[PDB]
Amino acid sequence: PNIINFDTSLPTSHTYLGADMEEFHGRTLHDDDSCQVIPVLPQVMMILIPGQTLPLQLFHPQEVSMVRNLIQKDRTFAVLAYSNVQEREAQFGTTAEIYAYREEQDFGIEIVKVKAIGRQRFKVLELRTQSDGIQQAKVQILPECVLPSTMSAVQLESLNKCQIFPSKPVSREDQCSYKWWQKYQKRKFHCANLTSWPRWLYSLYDAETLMDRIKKQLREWDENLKDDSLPSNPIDFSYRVAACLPIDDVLRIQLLKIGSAIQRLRCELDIMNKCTSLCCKQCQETEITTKNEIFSLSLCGPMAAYVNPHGYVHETLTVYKACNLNLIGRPSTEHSWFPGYAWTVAQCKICASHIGWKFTATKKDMSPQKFWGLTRSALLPTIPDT
């Protein structure tokens, strides 16, 4: 089941129409705590977090006018995090900038194959409905607060030369390199003896230790993940792990509201340690899969955002085994998605509703073999799992 085959680069490429993307890589930065007017693209209901790549297909003439308007502009558009779908119930969102755009205008209608990426988070101040073609909202950007090392306060000035230590001996080849972490704690957090808390408590708030703890479990999820792929910065690492968390909207917006990277890492670790069973969205007495069957098949992680050829985004989750699921369709490749893996609609026995797809390699000699493609919306994790 753990045999490694086929390259994880392909799903991230979003091979839906080929190549010749905009690919400007120019990026854009906005002043924090400022108040910017920004167009909100409608009918894109989903929680987007920074760093995540979002594919989009547009059919509404208002939306294609929006696409053009962005394409001359800085092309950063808002994506609200609808707490309730009732009308909007929107208080926070995430700006997304375009990095990949092509236009074909198939038949007499117009189609847009824009791919964007989230950049910054914000708190919505005035939603409004100006430009009845496309809603523009005036929002306040949430600043990214970064904290210094918790031992910088005590500041044992003589010991300051000992704050720099040799790098990890080897990435994972040596088990004695775990003693390096046991030695890292003794050196960096020695000045904790001047405070009222033990050394290990401060290690529970260190960014590096939390990053390594997550990285260890991520490599437990994927033995082939290896190093050099995850970002070194704590801020980007926290966002990347948040992308691959099979959680509901309430937890997702809870993660988005968190400003400090250390807080994000701590809560990501707690969810990653607690939630170990996913049931159906409505019938909680299903228990489709547990934590021990998750595996990543793309660099973004076990979870990724894809769009069917209808404009509907699907936050799929790759998983080895899914129980109480019955196939509906037939193994037809049709759309690319995962290259040459086909798809069959799946449903839970108790609840007559869509859950995900089933991918079976068409070449019969691919290691991923048969896996499941469950979606976030159809799955509801349980905190106690009991």
Place this chain on the structure above:
Amino acid sequence: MSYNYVVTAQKPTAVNGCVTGHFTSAEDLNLLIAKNTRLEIYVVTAEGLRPVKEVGMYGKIAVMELFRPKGESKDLLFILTAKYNACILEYKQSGESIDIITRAHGNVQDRIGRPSETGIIGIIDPECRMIGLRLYDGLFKVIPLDRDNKELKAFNIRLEELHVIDVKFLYGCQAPTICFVYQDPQGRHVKTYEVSLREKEFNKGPWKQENVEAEASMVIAVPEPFGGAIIIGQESITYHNGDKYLAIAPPIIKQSTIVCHNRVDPNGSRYLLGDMEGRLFMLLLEKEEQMDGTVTLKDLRVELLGETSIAECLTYLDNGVVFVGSRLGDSQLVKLNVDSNEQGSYVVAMETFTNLGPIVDMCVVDLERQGQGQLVTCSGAFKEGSLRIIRNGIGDEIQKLHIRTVPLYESPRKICYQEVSQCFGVLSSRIEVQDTSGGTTALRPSASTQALSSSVSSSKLFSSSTAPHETSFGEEVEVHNLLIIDQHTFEVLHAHQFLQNEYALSLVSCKLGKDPNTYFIVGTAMVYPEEAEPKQGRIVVFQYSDGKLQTVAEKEVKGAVYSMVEFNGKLLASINSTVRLYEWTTEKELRTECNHYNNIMALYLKTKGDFILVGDLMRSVLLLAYKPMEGNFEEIARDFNPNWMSAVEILDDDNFLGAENAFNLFVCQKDSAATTDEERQHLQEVGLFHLGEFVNVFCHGSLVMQNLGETSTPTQGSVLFGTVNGMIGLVTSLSESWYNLLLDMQNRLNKVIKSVGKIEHSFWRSFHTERKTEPATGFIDGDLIESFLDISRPKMQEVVANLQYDDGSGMKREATADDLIKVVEELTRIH
């Protein structure tokens, strides 16, 4: 809102650095000691230290140095604070009045830049042509000295090497040349540069950048003889000078890490080395000659001079006597001797100076006469550290406050007091090195071992599997004990020992339920290096009677209990982001009543009747209310502004005081009665004040006397806080009129008073952090008000020009030095 008054009741006693020079006069040798924000100048007399001055400048001391720029005599001082407030000082004496004049000053902060994790480096060119500051990564600030740069205008030179361990200037060079070791993936390399002010950039180094030991940390510049520099690592000492490279690896220094150094003689033949654990060695240079221009070293030799306190700085002053500026313990004035003392130690101590040091915990306890409440603090760490008893006045010794030391030779962590047994429940922990196969051994005779009774906990719980495999030969494992210490003789009566690899987190003394007996409740957590987050802990209870302890109850908790308080009639504990209320049954057993989960690790826990303040390390503070008619906790208000945070306290039912990163104090007020529910569910921050000290513990009570003026006292309530540098400050609450009057006084005093380094007091006290820097609000700098009476009468007249205010705060009657003096001398009694 939330008008508060903060006054230092005890100056900081931990030294950051001390320098020997000729500051006061060319013919006098001076020692300058930097106790955080207090610079003190002493004069050596060959029989001791003669204090000559003390100055409380507005800021910390990031770096301090002495240099004679050859332009004049009497030497000069350079000071750089944590807020980048560099200044040049001269000791100008006028007959009898002693003054510290500022030749030049300037703020040397960069607009945009991440401060280097290594920290501030403050090197001075031996020719005094320049000074070099390492403040930020990849940059090297330079300040020339030519009598012109009176504004301390510095320019930054780009540096390719990012991670720099230590930098120094080179003796005997026609142009200013620096040397520094740095870390790259290849390893640690010692590079050098030739900084030139002509092109305002660097040049080629005199020699190459050979590799050094992977743990190279110290760089030392020997004087013009021998040239070159010395690199000190964990286990290797090397000397580099051009082609010459001579390295030795003595086994004596292998035990610990060298963390202190300085020259011994102007020729640089001898050097003093202090290590991490307090041992002191002396390094020798052979001064080998072959012809003119010897510039050679035959070999290097070190010798274990002896054992002193844990050194933070060392200065060889006068001869034989060396001032070891300890920071964890108490600074000494030990004297070197050419001959051993029949014990292998060439060092003999002759004077020690008090140092409350860390003050990890405090206990305001009223001893003998009621009202005169003394303070007991758990100072120091490792072999240093003691119970410190501070008593204000005498009702024999003649001192404003008397300090009594009770050495423990191990680090204490928490303390409680018991009236019934008249005892002190002090938590403590020692370090033991594992044997080849034994159960570890001690290193010193500690308090937890030299006791009348030495019972050990033998609980049957926690019989699960574990892998101590990691326990190699040299493995300093912490053994935790609870010590029952007599109130009167302060002799350790009992030394109960906890389970192996069990961390005693919290301790309290209370009288639970209807039971008359009082107990010491100790909450401990089972910790294992493999497990990042502890999962098992226990709440044990002890009763002390007839000179013995007895575990009368011990409750498994399946968590890591961090802090426990005595909720009226019950036990309020915090386990793991859960706050649990335990009831004391008549069967002598804790019984859980209700547990509330608040999604944040409840580190700090305080009570104010039925209100409970819960605080995470990262500023997450929330309020809870225990409704007795039901028996559950309802969340009242919360506040999440992610920032480092060290302690909390409840001033009253509405204001909550706490500490924050960069040595700051904050007061959050529950406004309540708001129009909107979500508005009244959020605590409004009100007070911000850059204290300049890392507050470690809060404690209600005062050290002066009981209520003297009853309700006529302007100050309402009074708390004390103990810090890491040793200051014990006092915080009180005031009225609106008094707050306005004292703030006007503060502004006018800042207008009239002259600081040291020409540093604005408003900038110094402004709440400083990485997010922003707001000016201080809601706090009154009690030190300034108390210093108001310390200036001349003409200054008092100049500071009261058109005040009005004054007596009774009525009819805006004009002010005079009769009630302002009165109000100041009344305020100076609260502490």
Place this chain on the structure above:
Amino acid sequence: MPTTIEREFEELDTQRRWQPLYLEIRNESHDYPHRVAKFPENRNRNRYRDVSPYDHSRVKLQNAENDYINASLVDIEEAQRSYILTQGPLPNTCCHFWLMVWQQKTKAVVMLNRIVEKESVKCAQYWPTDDQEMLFKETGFSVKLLSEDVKSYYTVHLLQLENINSGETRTISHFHYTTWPDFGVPESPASFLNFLFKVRESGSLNPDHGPAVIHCSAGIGRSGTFSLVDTCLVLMEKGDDINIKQVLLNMRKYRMGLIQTPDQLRFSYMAIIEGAK
């Protein structure tokens, strides 16, 4: 002189391309949001959780709070005759259908399947065979049958739906194609031609009253083919010949009124050819 439509029909029969034709017409079909029609609190009122009426095509003529309807309206400018599409009438959706046809000024009702198709319940019966007047207090509706009106190949169940609270009445020629089993087509297209001629001559295909409502308890499999043959008859018989597939795609933009089997397409083409002249 035969037209190119008959030649294309014969070509499709010869090369056996009906199944590929339907497959490609379904692949080239395009969907529309229809997001409002599906809600977590609306699944109870949705007869089929699979299908969903497009938000732009569907009209929420409810004049109240919430009150979801699983209905839709189609309006093609080429035919100038709007039609209403619905689903199996659950009692809540039954009252919704009552108010829908009451507000739309409907003139006829077309039912194309039995209650007991495949010996099972697929649509909920709501019209009595005899008069059997019934008053529903959910919305103050009155149900009564004008006559039995049994025909050779079908039946007419004309109702006299009256609102008492509003105080008005409306007579609708509620047709009912009796000779039709579910997921199938009648063998004789002549009966279909006669029935559709009778319906078109009944005033339903006129702007006199509100658009007629056509339903087969699903509004997709059976109503779609009838609607497309009707629009083809009123589209290309009145002048220049128009290709069937393009206008079929155009009306498919309104709703997914597919056929689920190219046999229905063959029947539609046969009926259109028979109704040429």
